[PDB]
Design a protein around this ligand. Sequence first.
Ligand SMILES: *[C@@H]1O[C@H](CO)[C@@H](O[C@@H]2O[C@H](CO)[C@@H](O)[C@H](O)[C@H]2NC(C)=O)[C@H](O)[C@H]1NC(C)=O
Ligand SMILES: *[C@@H]1O[C@H](CO)[C@@H](O[C@@H]2O[C@H](CO)[C@@H](O)[C@H](O)[C@H]2NC(C)=O)[C@H](O)[C@H]1NC(C)=O
Ligand SMILES: *[C@@H]1O[C@H](CO)[C@@H](O[C@@H]2O[C@H](CO)[C@@H](O)[C@H](O)[C@H]2NC(C)=O)[C@H](O)[C@H]1NC(C)=O
Ligand SMILES: *[C@@H]1O[C@H](CO)[C@@H](O[C@@H]2O[C@H](CO)[C@@H](O)[C@H](O)[C@H]2NC(C)=O)[C@H](O)[C@H]1NC(C)=O
Ligand SMILES: *[C@@H]1O[C@H](CO)[C@@H](O[C@@H]2O[C@H](CO)[C@@H](O)[C@H](O)[C@H]2NC(C)=O)[C@H](O)[C@H]1NC(C)=O
Ligand SMILES: *[C@@H]1O[C@H](CO)[C@@H](O[C@@H]2O[C@H](CO)[C@@H](O)[C@H](O)[C@H]2NC(C)=O)[C@H](O)[C@H]1NC(C)=O
Ligand SMILES: *[C@@H]1O[C@H](CO)[C@@H](O[C@@H]2O[C@H](CO)[C@@H](O)[C@H](O)[C@H]2NC(C)=O)[C@H](O)[C@H]1NC(C)=O
Ligand SMILES: *[C@@H]1O[C@H](CO)[C@@H](O[C@@H]2O[C@H](CO)[C@@H](O)[C@H](O)[C@H]2NC(C)=O)[C@H](O)[C@H]1NC(C)=O
Ligand SMILES: *[C@@H]1O[C@H](CO)[C@@H](O[C@@H]2O[C@H](CO)[C@@H](O)[C@H](O)[C@H]2NC(C)=O)[C@H](O)[C@H]1NC(C)=O
Ligand SMILES: *[C@@H]1O[C@H](CO)[C@@H](O[C@@H]2O[C@H](CO)[C@@H](O)[C@H](O)[C@H]2NC(C)=O)[C@H](O)[C@H]1NC(C)=O
Ligand SMILES: *[C@@H]1O[C@H](CO)[C@@H](O[C@@H]2O[C@H](CO)[C@@H](O)[C@H](O)[C@H]2NC(C)=O)[C@H](O)[C@H]1NC(C)=O
Ligand SMILES: *[C@@H]1O[C@H](CO)[C@@H](O[C@@H]2O[C@H](CO)[C@@H](O)[C@H](O)[C@H]2NC(C)=O)[C@H](O)[C@H]1NC(C)=O
Ligand SMILES: *[C@@H]1O[C@H](CO)[C@@H](O)[C@H](O)[C@H]1NC(C)=O
Ligand SMILES: *[C@@H]1O[C@H](CO)[C@@H](O)[C@H](O)[C@H]1NC(C)=O
Ligand SMILES: *[C@@H]1O[C@H](CO)[C@@H](O)[C@H](O)[C@H]1NC(C)=O
Ligand SMILES: *[C@@H]1O[C@H](CO)[C@@H](O)[C@H](O)[C@H]1NC(C)=O
Ligand SMILES: *[C@@H]1O[C@H](CO)[C@@H](O)[C@H](O)[C@H]1NC(C)=O
Ligand SMILES: *[C@@H]1O[C@H](CO)[C@@H](O)[C@H](O)[C@H]1NC(C)=O
Lengths: 99, 49, 165, 203, 420, 50
Amino acid sequence: TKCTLKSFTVEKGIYQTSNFRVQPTESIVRFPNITNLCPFGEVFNATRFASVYAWNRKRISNCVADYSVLYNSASFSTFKCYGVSPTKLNDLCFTNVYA
Amino acid sequence: TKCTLKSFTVEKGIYQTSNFRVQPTESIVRFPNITNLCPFGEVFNATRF
Amino acid sequence: LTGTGVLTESNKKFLPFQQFGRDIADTTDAVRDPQTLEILDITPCSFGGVSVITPGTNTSNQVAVLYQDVNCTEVNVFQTRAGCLIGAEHVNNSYECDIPIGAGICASYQQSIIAYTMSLGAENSVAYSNNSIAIPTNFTISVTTEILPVSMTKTSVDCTMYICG
Amino acid sequence: SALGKLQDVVNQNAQALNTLVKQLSSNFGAISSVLNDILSRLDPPEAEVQIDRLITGRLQSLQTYVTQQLIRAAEIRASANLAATKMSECVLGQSKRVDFCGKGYHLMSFPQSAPHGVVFLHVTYVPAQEKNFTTAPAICHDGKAHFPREGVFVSNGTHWFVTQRNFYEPQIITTDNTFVSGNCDVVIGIVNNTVYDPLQPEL
Amino acid sequence: YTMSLGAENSVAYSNNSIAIPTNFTISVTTEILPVSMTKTSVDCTMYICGDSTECSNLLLQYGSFCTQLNRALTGIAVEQDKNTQEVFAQVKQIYKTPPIKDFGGFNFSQILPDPSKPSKRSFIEDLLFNKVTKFNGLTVLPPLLTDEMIAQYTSALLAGTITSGWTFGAGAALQIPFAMQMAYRFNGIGVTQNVLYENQKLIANQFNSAIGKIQDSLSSTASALGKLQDVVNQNAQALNTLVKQLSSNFGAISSVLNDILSRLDPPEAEVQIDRLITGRLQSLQTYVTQQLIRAAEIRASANLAATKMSECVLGQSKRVDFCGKGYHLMSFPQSAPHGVVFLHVTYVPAQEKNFTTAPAICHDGKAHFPREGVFVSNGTHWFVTQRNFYEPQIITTDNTFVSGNCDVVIGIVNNTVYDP
Amino acid sequence: LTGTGVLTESNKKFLPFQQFGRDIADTTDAVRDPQTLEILDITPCSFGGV
Ligand SMILES: *[C@@H]1O[C@H](CO)[C@@H](O[C@@H]2O[C@H](CO)[C@@H](O)[C@H](O)[C@H]2NC(C)=O)[C@H](O)[C@H]1NC(C)=O
Ligand SMILES: *[C@@H]1O[C@H](CO)[C@@H](O[C@@H]2O[C@H](CO)[C@@H](O)[C@H](O)[C@H]2NC(C)=O)[C@H](O)[C@H]1NC(C)=O
Ligand SMILES: *[C@@H]1O[C@H](CO)[C@@H](O[C@@H]2O[C@H](CO)[C@@H](O)[C@H](O)[C@H]2NC(C)=O)[C@H](O)[C@H]1NC(C)=O
Ligand SMILES: *[C@@H]1O[C@H](CO)[C@@H](O[C@@H]2O[C@H](CO)[C@@H](O)[C@H](O)[C@H]2NC(C)=O)[C@H](O)[C@H]1NC(C)=O
Ligand SMILES: *[C@@H]1O[C@H](CO)[C@@H](O[C@@H]2O[C@H](CO)[C@@H](O)[C@H](O)[C@H]2NC(C)=O)[C@H](O)[C@H]1NC(C)=O
Ligand SMILES: *[C@@H]1O[C@H](CO)[C@@H](O[C@@H]2O[C@H](CO)[C@@H](O)[C@H](O)[C@H]2NC(C)=O)[C@H](O)[C@H]1NC(C)=O
Ligand SMILES: *[C@@H]1O[C@H](CO)[C@@H](O[C@@H]2O[C@H](CO)[C@@H](O)[C@H](O)[C@H]2NC(C)=O)[C@H](O)[C@H]1NC(C)=O
Ligand SMILES: *[C@@H]1O[C@H](CO)[C@@H](O[C@@H]2O[C@H](CO)[C@@H](O)[C@H](O)[C@H]2NC(C)=O)[C@H](O)[C@H]1NC(C)=O
Ligand SMILES: *[C@@H]1O[C@H](CO)[C@@H](O[C@@H]2O[C@H](CO)[C@@H](O)[C@H](O)[C@H]2NC(C)=O)[C@H](O)[C@H]1NC(C)=O
Ligand SMILES: *[C@@H]1O[C@H](CO)[C@@H](O[C@@H]2O[C@H](CO)[C@@H](O)[C@H](O)[C@H]2NC(C)=O)[C@H](O)[C@H]1NC(C)=O
Ligand SMILES: *[C@@H]1O[C@H](CO)[C@@H](O[C@@H]2O[C@H](CO)[C@@H](O)[C@H](O)[C@H]2NC(C)=O)[C@H](O)[C@H]1NC(C)=O
Ligand SMILES: *[C@@H]1O[C@H](CO)[C@@H](O[C@@H]2O[C@H](CO)[C@@H](O)[C@H](O)[C@H]2NC(C)=O)[C@H](O)[C@H]1NC(C)=O
Ligand SMILES: *[C@@H]1O[C@H](CO)[C@@H](O)[C@H](O)[C@H]1NC(C)=O
Ligand SMILES: *[C@@H]1O[C@H](CO)[C@@H](O)[C@H](O)[C@H]1NC(C)=O
Ligand SMILES: *[C@@H]1O[C@H](CO)[C@@H](O)[C@H](O)[C@H]1NC(C)=O
Ligand SMILES: *[C@@H]1O[C@H](CO)[C@@H](O)[C@H](O)[C@H]1NC(C)=O
Ligand SMILES: *[C@@H]1O[C@H](CO)[C@@H](O)[C@H](O)[C@H]1NC(C)=O
Ligand SMILES: *[C@@H]1O[C@H](CO)[C@@H](O)[C@H](O)[C@H]1NC(C)=O
């Protein structure tokens, strides 16, 4: 009270404060378990690719894919990752992964 | 009126739903009449050259 | 000179020197025609908003629309100082204002929607004379109700949670 | 709709609050309206710009909300001062202010509570059964002009009476309800009659 | 120089001396009160964005700000109509004046409406209206009441107070001859009916001269109606500032969206676009906030005007300096473009003359007190005179009452009380 | 959908395709646990003040 009143004499009354962050116990994560590691080498290191004039879209879905192995690889240079960040890709969950 | 008030029922009154603005129709350009047209032609058609 | 508007013939004239003309607050007001030397005034075409008059879904669903400060020619139509009213029919009768439209014109639901000049009251010429008095011989004892707000909800927001959480 | 005024205030609050919360779902040019998602996708150096975009808009909305709340509080405070004055004058006493304590000659007011306000039941006196009478500014008797002490000089066409100004109670014209000032040569509308003296017959 | 508050008058106070007025200077003071401001509205989309589709695709990521602004302006306009209704629409059964204006010698021709069809106003109303004098997505809504109907309300109130008095403000308009209503208003301000009835001709020339002076003062000076002119100029200047804020870069390349959309690639032209958007939003928000504050001020003034019309026009106020300075008799409403003018008729004593007094008079050891007046002395003889007008009325038992003996009261002066 | 709150057992009925139901100001109010498909209500934790 006396710190927010900027004084050492307070007198009668009521005086307020700031956020009441009731600290939540632990942390819960409820990601669905497909129990199927997503084979992601289907796209990057696989057979011969298509041409730019006829580019092809691949789909990976209903699987648990990890981008950390991709970023950690030093061969995979020239990253931009517009709209997101490579370090924060891991915790994100997606559905429409158009490759 | 229902959509702007965002209520299915409305009550007696007057409500400014939207705005009306007249569309322009064709376009016009006006400049000083004729020209100060040069005696350029006498150069192209000169006799003593 | 670039813009949009209605280019009407103007009675007021520039000097032979002056070619353009502005209005007060520095807005274009008239321009002399360069082809033939005469001065045409400018009045930008109507852009007044549109409003809807309704008696309420409880009574009916008929709609009357007011295009403010727009002639009915520039899209039963009734021309009013407030604007052009469509869907409401003018009537010579006078009634107490029900849905205020403006400039003395009010609308009401009477089947359809009728618009009129509000009646200020019943014209009552008091029987005044310099030797005539009116004394009451009775009374009423009237109980009326006067509602007055004295307080509102004591809301209180915290900026940190609202902005950051 | 009788309590519409009170309802208005409530609405003017609730709507405002709703508007405020609806301002929490506005991008304000930012990538989203959720801080957690922005912090979970972008790096903090680049998430700072989006957080600034959200903060500027939210702070402007909050300041606008507080400003309109202050204006509403000013108007409600004016209304509360009016209500306190009406409780002090209409309720705790009898008010001679016209149309302050309802329409008509105010008699007394009864307060009643309402969720966010007060309702005054104004009991006022409205006289209505009119009768016209022929009227005199003054009465001439022995050249005295005999002005009325407390009432008006009405007449049934033929005879004259001194009634009170708000209820037809005729009473005869006597020296006890009538006082003398001057002679009958100055008053424009003087009317000649007889004022009765009680004392002489009382002998 | 150092200002002087006025003349250092020193009243001739004494513990036995009074100053009883012997005349009066019936006067008509003037009061001007604003009751409404210009009903305006702004199309926030058209204002901020003009007609560009890109800006209209923005200003929605900013949320419901435009709805807030137009709702506030609509509320202000409805409040202006409510103010005009409260000040003027206070009388039922719009009244008319008799064809024969025999109001005890009084002359209300300048305030009464004239058939010569200036709208339907009166002479004073014509002078008042003579004295005080769209584009860019902002319009002015016409007032719900037109000046003719406001003048009709004014004429109805004037006819009710001229013929009926204060009765039309309670129930039905009980007609009562003029110069008899005014006698009762004197009764209300203390002086008896004798003053008016014996001074009836004088109290019509005083009032007519006051009305003529009001006419001359209103005609002469251009700053007479300064309050309404200030209101109009303030509204016009706020509108002009709002308009001129459009031609402001606000940190962008230009104040015209077309130029920015022309000379820049839209992805980075977005920065200039929303810089202009924020600037115009701030300007509009400031305009709305100041309009709301000024509307609160105008609402206070309109409530004051309604209270005055209820108490001054429709009654006789005992409140001091409320309906003009002096003992208020009755008031007259007149309409002005955005306000009301009250012609406060007041009574002012003037022409004083001092005598010597006594709290009570001792007769037969009984300490008579004055029933309704003051005890005064001509230096030789004592009289009971009313407190606002010199009228001797030699002391009798009818106008004095006995409260004991001549011991406790301090300023006892021995005398005789006549017995009828 | 990160955030803190109390996850009470929900009583609202969901479309078998609807994943998470919001409310005014698009705050995540109800959510289906991806495993053991059921409905839960997210309610903000105690944020009163002192
Ligand atoms: C490429 O295919 C291999 C499967 O054999 C995986 O990546 C290999 O990882 C090992 C050790 O982690 C390295 O020694 C190899 O050089 C990698 N192979 C490469 C780079 O071609 C993985 O399945 C694929 N890499 C992806 C998907 O990034
Ligand atoms: C533009 O041209 C017209 C005609 O070529 C000029 O106006 C003519 O003026 C004469 C006499 O003043 C009239 O008899 C004609 O009827 C006019 N013509 C028309 C079409 O109205 C005009 O002066 C020219 N503008 C200039 C020179 O600025
Ligand atoms: C003056 O010069 C002009 C410009 O060259 C001539 O205009 C054209 O001239 C050619 C050749 O003389 C003709 O074939 C065209 O028909 C002319 N055009 C027009 C529109 O007439 C013009 O003829 C010359 N004047 C003369 C030669 O008397
Ligand atoms: C004043 O008005 C009241 C009614 O407002 C009159 O009382 C009514 O009298 C009639 C017959 O005399 C009865 O049938 C009604 O039932 C009465 N009404 C009430 C409410 O009591 C009263 O008579 C009037 N005053 C005079 C002097 O006639
Ligand atoms: C004038 O008012 C008086 C007051 O009552 C009326 O005089 C009396 O009327 C009654 C009948 O109602 C008679 O019985 C009395 O003899 C009257 N007293 C008199 C004449 O002194 C009288 O009727 C009224 N005059 C009118 C209405 O013209
Ligand atoms: C009331 O005023 C009128 C005129 O101002 C007077 O009474 C009328 O006088 C005319 C002629 O002077 C007569 O034709 C009418 O019949 C009269 N009517 C009435 C009702 O008296 C008179 O000066 C005033 N009356 C009083 C009593 O003061
Ligand atoms: C008083 O009544 C009489 C009745 O005519 C009128 O005044 C009288 O006028 C005559 C001369 O015309 C005098 O001789 C009388 O002395 C008067 N009577 C008095 C003074 O009482 C007149 O109608 C009345 N006086 C008024 C109304 O002032
Ligand atoms: C009370 O004051 C008024 C003026 O306010 C006096 O009226 C003036 O009287 C003189 C002489 O009698 C006249 O020449 C003026 O024309 C009067 N003026 C007006 C406007 O009528 C009145 O005389 C004073 N009363 C007394 C008793 O002296
Ligand atoms: C009330 O005052 C007005 C204006 O002061 C008078 O109107 C005048 O009428 C007479 C002839 O009718 C002329 O002097 C003028 O036409 C009007 N104006 C002026 C300035 O005099 C009106 O006559 C007065 N009322 C009465 C009953 O006389
Ligand atoms: C004060 O006024 C009284 C009342 O008029 C005066 O007494 C009267 O004086 C006159 C002449 O001065 C006599 O005719 C009266 O008979 C007196 N009235 C009586 C005796 O009752 C008194 O003189 C005045 N005093 C002054 C002017 O100083
Ligand atoms: C007003 O004040 C004066 C001044 O004291 C009083 O006059 C005095 O009266 C007493 C006897 O009553 C004398 O002894 C004094 O000499 C007087 N004073 C003067 C200065 O002469 C007077 O009594 C007071 N009157 C009232 C009503 O209070
Ligand atoms: C009243 O007059 C007398 C002087 O004539 C004074 O009062 C008298 O006081 C004596 C005793 O002091 C009593 O015996 C008398 O009866 C009184 N006379 C009365 C009451 O008439 C005194 O000067 C006067 N009273 C005042 C001035 O208040
Ligand atoms: C996936 O999670 C569900 C949770 O109900 C569990 O029943 C199932 O066995 C899991 N699949 C595995 C472990 O492969
Ligand atoms: C409005 O609706 C109610 C029922 O919702 C009905 O009782 C009432 O009569 C309606 N008012 C009308 C028809 O004017
Ligand atoms: C429509 O606008 C006004 C309103 O009636 C009118 O004076 C004007 O002549 C009309 N415009 C036309 C007929 O082009
Ligand atoms: C009455 O209404 C009709 C049709 O609206 C109109 O022609 C007429 O001028 C109005 N007035 C009179 C007095 O008929
Ligand atoms: C009351 O008014 C009527 C209406 O004209 C009239 O005939 C009657 O004489 C009036 N009565 C009195 C006493 O003036
Ligand atoms: C009025 O007051 C003055 C003081 O200036 C005084 O001289 C005069 O005597 C007083 N008048 C009477 C009648 O006492």
